[PDB]
Amino acid sequence: EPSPYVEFDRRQWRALRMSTPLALTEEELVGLRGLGEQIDLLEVEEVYLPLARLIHLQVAARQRLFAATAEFLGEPQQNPDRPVPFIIGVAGSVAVGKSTTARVLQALLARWDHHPRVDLVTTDGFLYPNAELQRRNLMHRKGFPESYNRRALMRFVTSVKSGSDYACAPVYSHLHYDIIPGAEQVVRHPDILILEGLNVLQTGPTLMVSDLFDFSLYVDARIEDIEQWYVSRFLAMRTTAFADPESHFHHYAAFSDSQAVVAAREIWRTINRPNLVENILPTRPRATLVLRKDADHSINRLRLRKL
Template sequence: MTPDLDHLAEAIRARNADGGRILVAIVGAPASGKSALSDRLYHHLGGDKAGAAVVPMDGFHFDNSILEDRGLLARKGAPETFDIGGLKRTLTALRDTQNEDVYVPLFDRSLEISRGSARAITPRHKIILVEGNYLLLDQAPWTQLHDLFDLSIYLEVPEEILRQRLIERWRGHGFDDAPATHKATSNDLPNAQTVIHGTGIADIWVMTCS
């Protein structure tokens, strides 16, 4: 089932009826299609010229040096490997300082690091699509984020499809079948299960099976 962009855009615009700024959480497990949906919604809403912007949670990955010091490098992508304090401060700034530019980091997958202040959210940006795995996670400290969102959308994908997608993702990075399967099942799939079983209530649930 393909997400109904018209329906989602209508729900977002309804929350933005007064013309102020809204923050929309787009949540799902790894490989659920969050980034793709965020990009499609961004363009469906009119893109930058219409005041839409995307803020990916991945920009708040801890640096590898911090993860290595904490013994978490092999778990990169798990909830404890993100700077949730920095994410909360940025989302709060987006809500509370709408008349100022707010700069957000972006994760560079080619370098495996976050680039600080890589995207500018300006006062003309009124619809902020915040996409990430754990934005609605029903465990501390992630629960601190829930009240910051005006609308939340959750992508529900069967676990077996996620498993296949995660393996294919690593194959696409040049790994053979065995190491791709190991990488997907040793870290990515447990993270996906954390999202599936630990996500709180979302306003809109989108089911996809392909």
């Protein structure tokens, strides 16, 4: 029965690398690797290289489209490099590794011929500040669609894709668990902008950032596996992130293994799992490429949208 997708196994997807060159060292990879992520140079070669190639084939092709419209409007043939920024979305559950995937992708794309300006923006910088979340009674819903200033977000991405010279996004501190007063991330007419976040693929009764994506990724895994990853990372943070006295999770540092497992499981049960099931997972169907990971964080299956 015909399908808009095409499934691959690592074997099949690996062959699509072709001549694509690997321009990243094991040392550079470490600096991009997030806590709990296994990614090695091999995976970058068999999985991330084919992806980078496909994306490179699409950037050119995507320009044909904006050009066609530009020609229809009679507008002057547009600037040879101040082109329409190519927007990439990276979605998935918390603790699934979106951070690593986006940072690795950014690195690969940056090391392409003629060195394209590749920016990466996470959506946590568009979360409402704690004070505002408290006001709306959303302090226990960080990550849910309603916890974001969606208009400011859509405004930012539209600015960038529309050719603005500079656009700014607020900044979120994981150490302080809130938006940083006065902090801003300035994006200046990049060639490629990667927008990473839990619900970047959401659709709605209004035009949303997902409507501006030229390509999108959805890092997937079995829900039980992701919970395990989450709990495991929670315990591990007792000596890294939570160890800092400024951490708003510092009281968790002292928790015992079982005490931490209980706490992590409750947060997952009451916050992250519901959000994944109700909001994130329902957006997976429209992702251009789904990276399916196994219990060991290994990407062993991929689903591409041919249509």
